[PDB]
Amino acid sequence: DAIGMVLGTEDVTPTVFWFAVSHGASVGLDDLVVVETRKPDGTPVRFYGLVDNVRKRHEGVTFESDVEDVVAGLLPASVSYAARVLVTRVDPENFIPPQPGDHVRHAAGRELAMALSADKMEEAAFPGGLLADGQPLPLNFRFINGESGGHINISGISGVATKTSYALFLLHSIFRSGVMDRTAQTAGGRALIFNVKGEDLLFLDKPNARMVEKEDKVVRAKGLSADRYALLGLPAEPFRDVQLLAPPRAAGTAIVPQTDQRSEGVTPFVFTIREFCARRMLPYVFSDASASLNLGFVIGNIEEKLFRLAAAQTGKGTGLIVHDWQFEDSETPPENLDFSELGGVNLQTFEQLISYLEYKLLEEREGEGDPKWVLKQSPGTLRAFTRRLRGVQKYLSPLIRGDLTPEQAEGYRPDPLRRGIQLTVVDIHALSAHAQMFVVGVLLREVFEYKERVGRQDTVFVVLDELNKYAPREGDSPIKDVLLDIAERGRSLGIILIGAQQTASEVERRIVSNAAIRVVGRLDLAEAERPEYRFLPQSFRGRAGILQPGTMLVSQPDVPNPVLVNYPFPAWATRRDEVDD
Amino acid sequence: DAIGMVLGTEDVTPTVFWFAVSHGASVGLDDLVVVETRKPDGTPVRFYGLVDNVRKRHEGVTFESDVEDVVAGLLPASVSYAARVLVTRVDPENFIPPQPGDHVRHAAGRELAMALSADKMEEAAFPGGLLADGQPLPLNFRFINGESGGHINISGISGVATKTSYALFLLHSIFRSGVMDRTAQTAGGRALIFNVKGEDLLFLDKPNARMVEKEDKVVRAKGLSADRYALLGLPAEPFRDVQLLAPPRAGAAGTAIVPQTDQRSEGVTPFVFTIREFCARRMLPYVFSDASASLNLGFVIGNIEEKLFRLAAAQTGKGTGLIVHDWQFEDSETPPENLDFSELGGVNLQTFEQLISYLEYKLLEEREGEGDPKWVLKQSPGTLRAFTRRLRGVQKYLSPLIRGDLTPEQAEGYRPDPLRRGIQLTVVDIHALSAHAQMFVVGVLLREVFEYKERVGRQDTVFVVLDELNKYAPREGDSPIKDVLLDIAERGRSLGIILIGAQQTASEVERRIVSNAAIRVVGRLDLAEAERPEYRFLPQSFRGRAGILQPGTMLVSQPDVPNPVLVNYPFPAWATRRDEVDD
């Protein structure tokens, strides 16, 4: 149990000190070490630290050109192997230096738990990954579910850092470790995740045949005792209760999902015109936050009109029936127009709904429009609102249907909170950016409203990638607003964000600032020194530039510095090729 | 009883110097030391200081590889134990360098008083915690009650830093030390605290069932002569006079009023607001708490608040509801089948939705959509809808809190008054309520207390204990709740309103609120935040230490003493959880 001796040739301070590695021992860059010293009074003090600097030097060589002779042993010299320890905790809080010559050892048992502040975690610790030699890393669940800490934020080079895989692992850990019941001691968990990568998120229902092979290879290499999942205490199995939703293909009443390689088990999801109006979906059409005009007054006004109009609807249908649409000279044709038994037009398509908005705002009274709808708003602002609806109508029109019947509508409505479902996967990769931002906006706002009305209830995890897309640093959008609501109010409300981006400096400062858990994959060279990565010490930056895929640094409030960690291969399928018959 | 001698190998200056720790003594990083030197004419000069750096080195080892041999005794080397002193005080204020070889000693009873400027705190000193595993650290109450100082601002990582516990400890110390009596020689103490945690602050009048074992364990470990509370001189009992207020459960359609508390069903009083009082006390501005990014609704809110205030004054009845005679529903979708009508044909608004409906009618339906001209003072239609839409959006959340249905006697009993006679501590339960209701309740109570002090004068010291200060007083937003916090910060000293506020980072809080705190306490700080400009009052030496501070461990900084002082405080004598209750 001897790894080295505290060095006296370098200063020995309570925060930082060096030690010499014993012969036959190897000290890695991230190794967690404990050294115990004796006070003059005789009472002991334990120092728990992490190695941030490791070096090897030749102590007696006068010139670098004598190195060939020195290695041979012809010239007298001694190789010196030393490490620097960054103090994280002192069991007795005495800020006195350890004596040179004190024994340094790897934290392995109770010492390792003390170093990672597992005593503060208590029953709330659950596996956040693997340490150097198969020891699990305790993650304090109370800082994920909102008791004392907020959400999770993952950063790293997209394509190189494995951000989404680590998120899915954390969901697996949270769902299968039992910490939800332990911290509850309402005690359950749900997750909503969006497939935008192809069909990668679409087979996490099935076991991954390649997991065993790849697992055993790594197991034999690093010499772990059992399978990496077994070391964390987690079953190597897929997600138990999974729902796959997809958009409704492409003037046919029949509906079947846009998915190609996975066709079995996938359910189409659609919105109705009536629900569109009733549930104030209109703002989530305007996802261009990068820079724009102030349509807030127009959107709010038309939104309220549509809501009141939807509430007045007595019919059972899914479309919206309006009685004040006349076509003295509207390009729109009276044919193909569902007409009510009361002479009202029943809007069955999104393009018809925009046509009616054009009429109320721009054609109604020889061009000045219906004053109840245009509330003194300028013609230029109205037509901006109109033209943007026209621009996205083709892309949103298949997702919003009024021609569907009530049977189909109740069946196909996307509910991330459906009973008996733990993981909802919404397949948006076939949709355009406008349909993506629309669907994400509506669904997130639906979950937020529901938790506002009822309460914390079940803790709902939202796993979102490309955070810079949805919540830019400088823009302002509705979809960014619901993510702000989730970040700032989600702890108490029970909506927890597991978000990832290539760089946190491109994400809204209030989303990133509210993540209790920060996880860093391989970081770009320039990004590591940015202000948003101050929680990584300078020691880590050079290492972080070359971190291998699968390797993350996790930082959480309980323990002061980031800890490097690895995590197993997915027990679930992430592409079509990994599914047995 | 000397701990070392001034070192000549490092420069000796009046402000900063090194000393060598003598054999058999241990010198900690935050230890208070005193050194005495002698002028050539024989007069003595005393240096009171704090250690900020401490180190150990091998003096004679020529190669690092030797260490193993050197430890065995085969090679000669000596361990060099040295500490650096940051001078806080010079008692004869002669800025001369101490002479090398002078004797360094731990600060003694009287020497400790001089080092912590206790002489400046004649009798206003009260216990602020335990320092250096030793003696109580004196806190100047005159910098907390506003005679010479403002309020307290506590900062640290929520969850690990023990921020709220240190605030409650300070309250206990102020209220039991008798320092209120001493500083008097209109000299009484009151405290308002909001429970935003899950019923954590609802058991402050119950004794801590595990505070004896936990304190005892600490006493055994550090060999203290007596208990930590005993060492401070403060009794180890809970808050004596406590008021617990909670919102009403099943508020909509239920006349019976019952509090929303689940864990504690005894001694908790339900608190409700009344529609006439809402109009009379101009509480409308507090409904608009979303200052993150907002429209210029200031004129509409001001316009309606005055109209509502005048309407309340016009009421002739003693009834809680508001009576309006100018509301009609020709085409407005507000059925009157369930409504209360006055003797003179007026309508009595008993529900929050009804008040908003009346406002919607005056603003948007009164004259074929034009609206009553007196009510909308040439405000754009979009601006009126934004004001109306926000009220409808928040109506379900504030409806249980604002009731016009109750009788005057019922309302008088239920109104939440922090200044109620015979009450020293008031706890308002806000955990059940939504963020909008929470923001509305804090602003109304703070403004009512602040306004009452302005008319009456400062007859009592009201301590307002508020966590998550970034939420209520953001750095760049502008809100009514921020404005009442600003009034408390900038005018509370003379007015007697003292803010004990806590945030995870002062960087997220309004510069004026943090700048007006005379006392600054720091728990374990985030790695990034120590480098920031809001934490310049920590010397650079402290930063690396502050990154790893344990729960229970705080650095307190006050104007009388130049550098921060590391402190510990006892475990709470009051219950902070349902299981910590002692029967």
Numbering used by the authors:
A (entry chain B): 13 to 197, 206 to 270, 273 to 603
B (entry chain A): 13 to 197, 206 to 603
List passages from the publication reporting this PDB structure.
The nuclease NurA and the ATPase/translocase HerA play a vital role in repair of double-strand breaks (DSB) during the homologous recombination in archaea. Each drHerA protomer comprises three domains: the N-terminal HerA-ATP synthase barrel domain (HAS-barrel domain) that forms the putative exit for the substrate, the RecA-like ATPase domain, and the helix-bundle domain which is inserted into the RecA-like ATPase domain and forms the putative entrance for the substrate. Herein, we characterized, for the first time, the crystal structures of D. radiodurans HerA (drHerA), with and without ADP binding, and a low-resolution cryo-EM structure of the drNurA-HerA complex.
Full-length drHerA without any ligand was crystallized in space group P3121 and the apo structure was solved at 3.0 Å resolution by single-wavelength anomalous diffraction (SAD) phasing using selenomethionine-substituted protein crystals and then refined with the native data. The refined drHerA apo structure contains one hexamer (six protomers) in the asymmetric unit. Not as apo ssoHerA that predominantly exists as a heptamer in solution, drHerA in both nucleotide-free and ADP-binding modes have been crystallized as sixfold symmetrical rings. The six N-terminal HAS-barrel domains from the hexamer formed a pore with an approximately 28.5 Å diameter that is large enough for B-form dsDNA threading. A pore with an approximately 24.5 Å diameter was formed by the helix-bundle domains, which is enough for the entry of the B-form dsDNA. Although the last fourteen residues of the C-terminal protrusion are disordered in our drHerA structures, we believe they are too short to stretch into the neighboring protomer. The drHerA apo structure and the predicted drNurA structure were further organized and fitted into the low-resolution cryo-EM map of the drHerA-drNurA complex by Chimera. However, drHerA spontaneously forms a stable hexamer in the absence of DNA or other cofactors.
